[PDB]
Amino acid sequence: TQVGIVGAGPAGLMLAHGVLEQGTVEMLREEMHAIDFRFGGRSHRLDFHEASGGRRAWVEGLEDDRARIVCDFVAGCDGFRGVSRGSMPGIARGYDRIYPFGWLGILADAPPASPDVTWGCSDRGFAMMSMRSPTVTRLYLQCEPDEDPDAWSDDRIWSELHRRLDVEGMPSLREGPIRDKGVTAMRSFLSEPMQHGRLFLAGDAAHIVPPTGAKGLNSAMADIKVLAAALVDHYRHGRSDRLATYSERCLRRMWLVQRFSAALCTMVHQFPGQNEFVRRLQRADLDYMTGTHAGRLQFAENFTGLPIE
Amino acid sequence: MRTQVGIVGAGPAGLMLAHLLRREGIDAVVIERAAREHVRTRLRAGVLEQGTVEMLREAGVGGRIDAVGMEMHAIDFRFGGRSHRLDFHEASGGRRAWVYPQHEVVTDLMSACDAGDVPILYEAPVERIEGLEDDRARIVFGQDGAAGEITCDFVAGCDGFRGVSRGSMPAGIARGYDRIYPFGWLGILADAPPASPDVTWGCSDRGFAMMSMRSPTVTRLYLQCEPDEDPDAWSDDRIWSELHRRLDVEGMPSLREGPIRDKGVTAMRSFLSEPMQHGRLFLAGDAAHIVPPTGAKGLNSAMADIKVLAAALVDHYRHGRSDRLATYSERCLRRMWLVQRFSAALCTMVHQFPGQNEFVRRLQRADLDYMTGTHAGRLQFAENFTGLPIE
Ligand SMILES: Cc1cc2nc3c(=O)[nH]c(=O)nc-3n(C[C@H](O)[C@H](O)[C@H](O)COP(=O)(O)OP(=O)(O)OC[C@H]3O[C@@H](n4cnc5c(N)ncnc54)[C@H](O)[C@@H]3O)c2cc1C
Ligand SMILES: Cc1cc2nc3c(=O)[nH]c(=O)nc-3n(C[C@H](O)[C@H](O)[C@H](O)COP(=O)(O)OP(=O)(O)OC[C@H]3O[C@@H](n4cnc5c(N)ncnc54)[C@H](O)[C@@H]3O)c2cc1C
Ligand SMILES: [Ca+2]
Ligand SMILES: [Ca+2]
């Protein structure tokens, strides 16, 4: 064939054809207004819809004449554990930072106590309440990176979620039967370049982020929006400049996405043994982000999605 | 020997407070450990926030800043081989900063204090501060071996990072937050007229450097160096070599060299102590908090503390209300944690950290790109650099 797509993820199916950015929605087409950051015993509802001016969120032979997937071009869409990223010659460079924690996630048959996605930036550790339906809620707890889910009974999970999320004046967390308990990792990684000859990387094969900020899929999509158009210009108008600049343009937008994702991750989680000045700057960062127009503006523009080149 | 407010330290914070109190009729005595001639000739550059300039102007000591203070509109951030001129006057909607050296602020304030007969004791190091919950506080000092005591309603601890007032808090009350960064600054003056007029920051992966105007014919230059560094390990040739490497970009004039003088090394540290008051003791300025000099914030923060403290003391003596004294620390700390955030953000973005994680290192360029390249980034920089509001 012309284009050999490795991996059948959301990036692999978007080229052949959680929380989503407005750009990801319109790309699929072609509903969130605020996040409640809780800290210091108080709710801080950051209306990013208003601050953003109306944007919203929603819930072998790569140098030869032909490439061979054991086609003209190979689209690496095989995620963080695929083989496409290692399919390059000294060409690749890796930027890696793992965070000293994971997330314990549950799906509960209980109505959300509030309609906004809620971030509990507690000194016990991070917690998050997100919705799915008026009767189904999605919840996360910061936990040890290698945590055994068997150590967390249903009662332990609800107790800790209450401690990390409840504040006076807001409805308390509603409890219900628990489904889909699991532990997921927290890691920042990016690899350069994102192309080499006939091999083009996208999505998790190129770069992973911590889920704080909901960017891993939305960046995979923008990766595909760019790779798809370049292949269109190549096959339709005989124009190869877009393919040659694929890595350059994806990396520009992604390094700003890594920035935002990491900024949230390092702000809302507790780091064991951290320098006490750096630890107190987490609250200063939360106060500035929620409490000033400039802080709210930067959050709103980044959360709803950066432009795509 | 008896007064209303005893002020420990005749640096900018103490002199400003003595001056404000004098014009409100409130009696104060300033006690300073060094010699007047020493304090008067401590030369230090200075970038003043607009609020600081307004404060000096409204206290009758802004005449010379109004006459020769050099209005500053932009910083040139150099990285990735290019200049990025961030116009914070535009980004902030018209607020700005002024280049006006700290030693001339101190000259201005000392002249105002002397013209108002404010009593200042020099060569009189304070040894203890006691009676913080007595009817009147006691400042125990010595000139030579002569023991002295000043009795006062309130003690303003304006004696800097190395003073005695911070340690006079009951240690079960005070909490410190401290980070020493793993680098210092090698600083020089060069007898060469500045090639570019803007404050210029070299922020590339080769290491931090800074260039600014000391005077029309003298350039101030800083280089990131090792924290314990001997200035004698930096010959003139090594200095110019590193400065060219860290600052020069195509499309901007190359560095103008000239005689090097005033070579020295300074440390980089973020520190804040809580609370800023206990009983009759109120801390202000470097006695309470210091920042790394990226961002031009230490003197301006000391002046913000003094603005709040003087107004609280006026409310107490003039209007008989003590609630503003009661909230001094709460209000000053809220601002100062945001100043610490800003100074720290600049410091961790523009310096190379030895052995740093390569992902975290590359986010430095992402942060520079976002701060210079987006309206939202420029706005935040500009509002912080020109000065946050004061409560
Ligand atoms: C807990 C959690 C929450 C998240 N929340 C959000 C969110 O709210 N918003 C958001 O935008 N993102 C979110 N993400 C990130 C997002 O889910 C991922 O970034 C996304 O899966 C990336 O898509 P991808 O197709 O590139 O990778 P994947 O989805 O991992 O696709 C890789 C595919 O390739 C296949 N494959 C692997 N190796 C090979 C091989 N050798 N040959 C063939 N096939 C192979 C795999 O089996 C898999 O099907 C979250 C991630 C986690 C873990
Ligand atoms: C190189 C450099 C550049 C800077 N640039 C800027 C800038 O552009 N903008 C900015 O806002 N800030 C800047 N700063 C920070 C600023 O200089 C300080 O924050 C400022 O000096 C703080 O003033 P202060 O009155 O609190 O303390 P200090 O100036 O330290 O004065 C304290 C005084 O107390 C006296 N004292 C100490 N112990 C005793 C004792 N026991 N008894 C009596 N007296 C005592 C000392 O002798 C001294 O005179 C810079 C700092 C440096 C090092
Ligand atoms: Ca088990
Ligand atoms: Ca007594």
Residue numbers in the entry:
A (entry chain D): 3 to 19, 46 to 58, 71 to 99, 130 to 140, 152 to 170, 172 to 391
B (entry chain A): 1 to 391
Copy out sentences from the published article reporting this entry, exactly as the authors wrote them:
We initially determined the crystal structure of XaPobA at a resolution of 1.6 Å. An imidazole molecule derived from the crystallization buffer bound to the active site of this structure (XaPobA + imidazole). The imidazole molecule was surrounded by hydrophobic side chains of Val199, Met210, Trp201, and Phe385, and a hydrogen bond was formed with the main chain amide of Thr294. The Arg214 side chain, which anchors the carboxy group of the substrate pHBA in PaPobA, swung out and was not in a conformation suitable for binding to the canonical substrate. The main chain peptide bond of Thr294-Gly295 was notably flipped in the XaPobA + imidazole structure, suggesting that the Thr294‒Gly295 region was flexible due to the absence of hydrogen bond between this region and Cys347, unlike PaPobA.
